[PDB]
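Let us walk through a complete example step by step. Step one is to write down the protein sequence. Step two is to encode the small molecule, zinc ion, as a SMILES string so that its atoms and bonds are unambiguous. Step three, shown after the inputs, is the structure prediction itself.
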Amino acid sequence: MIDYTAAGFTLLQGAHLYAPEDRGICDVLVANGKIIAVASNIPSDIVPNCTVVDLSGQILCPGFIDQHVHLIGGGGEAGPTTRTPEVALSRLTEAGVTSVVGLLGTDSISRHPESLLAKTRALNEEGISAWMLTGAYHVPSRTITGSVEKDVAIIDRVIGVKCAISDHRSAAPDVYHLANMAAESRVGGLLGGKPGVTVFHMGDSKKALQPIYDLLENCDVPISKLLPTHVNRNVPLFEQALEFARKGGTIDITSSIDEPVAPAEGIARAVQAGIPLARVTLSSDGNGSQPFFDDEGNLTHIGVAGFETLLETVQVLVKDYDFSISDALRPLTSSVAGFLNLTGKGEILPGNDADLLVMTPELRIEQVYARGKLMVKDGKACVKGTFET
Amino acid sequence: MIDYTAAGFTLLQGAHLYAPEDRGICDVLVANGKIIAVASNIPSDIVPNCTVVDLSGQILCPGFIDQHVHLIGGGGEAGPTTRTPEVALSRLTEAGVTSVVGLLGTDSISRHPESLLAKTRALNEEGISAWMLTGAYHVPSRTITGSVEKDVAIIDRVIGVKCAISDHRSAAPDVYHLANMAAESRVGGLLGGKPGVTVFHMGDSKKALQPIYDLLENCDVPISKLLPTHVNRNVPLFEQALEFARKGGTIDITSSIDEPVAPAEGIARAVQAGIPLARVTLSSDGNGSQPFFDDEGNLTHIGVAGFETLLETVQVLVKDYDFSISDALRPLTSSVAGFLNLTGKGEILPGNDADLLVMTPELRIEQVYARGKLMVKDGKACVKGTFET
Amino acid sequence: MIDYTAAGFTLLQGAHLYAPEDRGICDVLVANGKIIAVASNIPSDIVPNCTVVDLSGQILCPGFIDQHVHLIGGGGEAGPTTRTPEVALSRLTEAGVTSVVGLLGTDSISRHPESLLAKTRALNEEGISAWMLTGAYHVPSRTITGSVEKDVAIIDRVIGVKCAISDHRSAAPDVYHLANMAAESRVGGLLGGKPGVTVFHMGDSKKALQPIYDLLENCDVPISKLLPTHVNRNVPLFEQALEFARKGGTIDITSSIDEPVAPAEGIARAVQAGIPLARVTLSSDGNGSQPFFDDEGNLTHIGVAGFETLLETVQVLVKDYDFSISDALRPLTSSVAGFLNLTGKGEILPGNDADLLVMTPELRIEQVYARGKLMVKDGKACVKGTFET
Amino acid sequence: MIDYTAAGFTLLQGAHLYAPEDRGICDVLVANGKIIAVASNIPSDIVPNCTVVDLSGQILCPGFIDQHVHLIGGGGEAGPTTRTPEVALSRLTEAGVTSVVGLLGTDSISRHPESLLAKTRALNEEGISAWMLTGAYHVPSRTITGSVEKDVAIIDRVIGVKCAISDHRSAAPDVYHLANMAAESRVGGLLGGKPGVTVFHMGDSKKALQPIYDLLENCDVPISKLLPTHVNRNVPLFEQALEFARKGGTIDITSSIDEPVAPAEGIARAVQAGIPLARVTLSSDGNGSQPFFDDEGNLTHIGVAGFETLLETVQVLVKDYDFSISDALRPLTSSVAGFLNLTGKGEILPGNDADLLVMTPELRIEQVYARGKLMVKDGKACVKGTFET
Ligand SMILES: N[C@@H](CC(=O)O)C(=O)O
Ligand SMILES: N[C@@H](CC(=O)O)C(=O)O
Ligand SMILES: N[C@@H](CC(=O)O)C(=O)O
Ligand SMILES: N[C@@H](CC(=O)O)C(=O)O
Ligand SMILES: [Zn+2]
Ligand SMILES: [Zn+2]
Ligand SMILES: [Zn+2]
Ligand SMILES: [Zn+2]
Ligand SMILES: [Zn+2]
Ligand SMILES: [Zn+2]
Ligand SMILES: [Zn+2]
Ligand SMILES: [Zn+2]
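Step three: the predicted structure of the complex.
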């Protein structure tokens, strides 16, 4: 016998594949964590030491990419006890997440980019794929190297910058500050080969997207680099978002937000609005707090987001909204990889990474592969974080 | 015998001299790298140990001054592989260039002024004349001493500052920032005895020269110190440039730009426009990248500029545009030396530096003298950079 | 027809394999840039779309790891005209180099770690494997993030720090300074998963290795993290190096140094002195200058190192010294990978990266694979750096 | 009539020339500020538009290099009223000084290197040759760019660094501090093409040269880069200076110090001690104060140094000591140019700069040429600084 085990040959057989594109019943061959073949009827013997998997009667689709996650924990709006814990690997995989983008939020005093960066690396080490955004709510941005432009250019895992606008928790940034920060991210991205995006956490202020427009008049950053998130938090806001996307911008809907615009609802409206799913993304905001402010900007209620709403959103869309499974997945798969330029992610194509989900026809997660590795079986993590308990 | 070789007496005989002014058939005597005499019929014996050169049937003219060169290399817009290599001496001389001004571009993270400065000095050491601009696209400027005003005042080779406006790769500078930076360069120039110019890399933004005008309203810097470059990159832009020059400004046309306004074309239009050649300069942008952005600010194509377009431009002008050789040379000779106040350069006058070109009547380079030294013979570098291979 | 091309299946058939360990005539199967199987007689049909290569008659071995190259150039010891040029991809590959460690030297004023960092990524992007050392001759170290520890911990390509001792070009560091730096490097390595080494450039001072010894008594940094290079520069130095390795240290021999101790000669004595090859490495110092200094510390002669000395050394060892091919390889392969912990490098094993050299039985390089990609064919690069001409 | 005036042809006829080497009665031909020929009997008609000068009866020699002047003023040791005034051009020239090295002293609070730097350029601009030393008594050094190494490497006029030891006015530097600084200077010189020296101001402390020796053992800086000045300030000091030169060091004698060892007397003993004149220099310390301190370190008397002591010393040497004129000159010429590597200075050779002194046979200065320009006529300056009155 000759040993060919180093290749990790895996053949996933008989599933109804959504690439996301519906490819009907198709096969997928994997080696060294990469998809090396996609076709109907692949020879179970085509390669030595192959692990064959019968997925007949099952759905096969790309892993989710969650671009809004408080990896190291977040919160703190109601003081120190409200600091949320760090994210555990198993909570992501089990939710279908195989690629994630970490960021900071309100607190950047007890929360640091260097911490966020080490955690990002831990996750890659443990099997999934992770990147981060530098900055936080605070503007100017608190960086690792002292320059937003520098952080994006030279820190491998940094792909852009985060900020807070139209929020009672913002730093009251002016347009110069915003423009310069976005322009730096843009430039850093070209030098480092990163998307160089600027993510705007939106609050409830009446000004809504104004600041974005102003920015656009005060710089030459492409609209394709600006990403407003939580767009469903309020009506008027959601509405402007739709125009923004119509003008070519992309928009990020938060699945952990149920009122006033539900996630599935929002997506559907965007389409009806004539916006292409490619310019619509869905993110969780997992591990952040769900702070609720009153009339006088006083906190009242505070909770913590999880990742289940992701799948739930997809299910809904299909179930109650006439969406095709294909269509329903885009906002968590190719639209994201497409916006962030995540090479090798969000699509099942030869040459892409083996980040795959195995589900039941009714859309329930059964298996999860990360870079070709089995992470979840029977809806249960079989691979956990070094200290997961 | 007495040895008078230290003087390096050279007598260039019988050429049709363009000073650039047409001086018909005239002689040029050189000593210690300086032009010591210009007259018809100089006695081949007037001085001991004289090297006599018969240039009969040939054209003699001043060396080009290229004020836009990425000496240390540039690029990087499409990531690290796109970083261009440093400039080799021979590539300049062979192209007729004897004086050059180095600068930085988009990247000032992997690119540094101290590097640019050491390279500048190397070139002077090897025989040609070189200066640099401090700063880069980024505003505020990244300097050597920490102050634009300081760099221009105290670093001998620095003659001004560079910046990027109306470009999707700019740093989103505001007017205060621009004004202050130009005002600093202005002041530093008076203290250090430098032109103290401010060079503006122009992009494709609709705002075009606006920022310049605004600046002008927000400071008392003389229009003669502001230099917009790449003016031929787009029509509307080119058009505003013409008014700008009409208002007394000088403009820099980029020879490496063929569309939408060709170099020769631009020059011709400026004249027809009633602008004096003295306020029109031509620069190469050699060794920089030729990045091409799409609709959404996405790169598509990327190349690297060389120096041949310089001469080619001159040839064209004469050839296809009814320009006099004299006139055709100005934009690469006296207009430049005149704008930057390069003393001893751009004109063949007693007391000036022996920076001369020998060409065929059809305008082809045969010989090149830098500070009286033979650098190119028969269109071939006979003097190369320390590591040129 | 099913496409399986994504896999990059390549089978290297019937060469005499030195892993470096002599494996006699053995086959090598590659996929995705990985070595997936090594064994005698592999079925050319074992995998689809395979590219079969007949190496019968030839030698196959691991690609070289050169841990001492001035990637972006060096020199400057005699003025700006002496700054050497960056390294070209093809230069490396053609010399059998598939893995490299970039560093800085004397000049850390016109040279910057950020530049080095970028160049290193470009090389990875182009096809080979590259890392770097932070710091330079100067002590205290000039870093990217402002701290040696921080640089080693957080910048992905940084594996340790560089410095100079016992040289008329040193910073006159004291012991505290040395110790701290190495400590920092040590610790950053733990945090970042890097070797955390400290490389000492050795000069021609009489104090020789003292500083390393003192250091040892002034800190708890393992002797296994300390690397003295250019050991062959002088006799008395060479000799202490020997004892140093004897104490468990590892020494680095410079192949570009002929006198007094030539490379092959240095390795022979190591062995004679009873030193295990594992503790002996060979590196080029390619692209650095060859500055020769007088009695009064005055430069005289200055040259520029290449990579041919590496293969040359191997040849000589085998040819004039009676070293086994296997043993001759070690210092450029397993030994290096061994010291730097370059996982997946230095040996031909399943799971390892497909960095392979194909040579004639007379030790001539014919082909070169970097991460399984054909880089050199018939002793010539079919893969060039973006700007090679 | 052809104009050849640009050349500045001047022929110095029939003087007894000391290059300093006795060349007997020899002619000197100048052009462009350069010495183009030296020989007996040069044809007054050898070159056009020549200015012929009859030096028959006179002595011609090289202009003095004073490497120790407080160009911008000094003093301050007894309050602000004691700050001396800047140096006036004419003051220098009249004293035979054509080349100068400016520096700072005790006070580095009201005095700045930037000021010094500017003053140095003004002098070059006005007609002579000037350089400076960075630092001052204070250690660590107060620099322009923030680093000694950086200043020596990148500021064109900076040739090294200054400091003070064994003085009640010192900064109490320790050895590390000293060593580092000199190292820095050393290295910056290599990079910038400068001598890279370190000049030690000697005080009247009993420790005398110790610090220099310690230093020597704590670094690899060549003894040839270290200059102790004011050696004649005290006996015991003088005496170690002697051995110091004996070891290969070069010592600097202050002409403005009469007791205990007078200048001429210091030079005589050097020679007596068998020291080669090449290792002995003379400098004025012009414009510095003459602060006399008590027993309790209290100031008593305070005065201001001039430049007449230089010529005076020469005179005395010849006149009361039996030194050859030739030998008497050395310490102010070839020796200095020699130590500082002032190319084109200190000797009368073709190719050298035309910095010449014309004296009476009794050693009286009549004329002075700086870079071939007549600066002094009939012992008086016909060329004055911009603000002299
Ligand atoms: N509340 C979140 C911030 C956000 O969700 O925008 C946090 O943890 O900082
Ligand atoms: N693309 C150029 C910048 C410019 O040409 O404006 C560079 O090399 O940075
Ligand atoms: N001469 C080399 C230094 C060395 O080999 O460390 C350089 O480029 O700096
Ligand atoms: N007294 C002088 C100092 C010295 O001579 O070094 C001064 O002006 O500071
Ligand atoms: Zn938010
Ligand atoms: Zn959030
Ligand atoms: Zn530009
Ligand atoms: Zn440019
Ligand atoms: Zn070295
Ligand atoms: Zn080296
Ligand atoms: Zn002193
Ligand atoms: Zn003094």
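Step four is interpretation. Residues 64-342 of chain B form a domain with the TIM Barrel fold (CATH 3.20.20.140).
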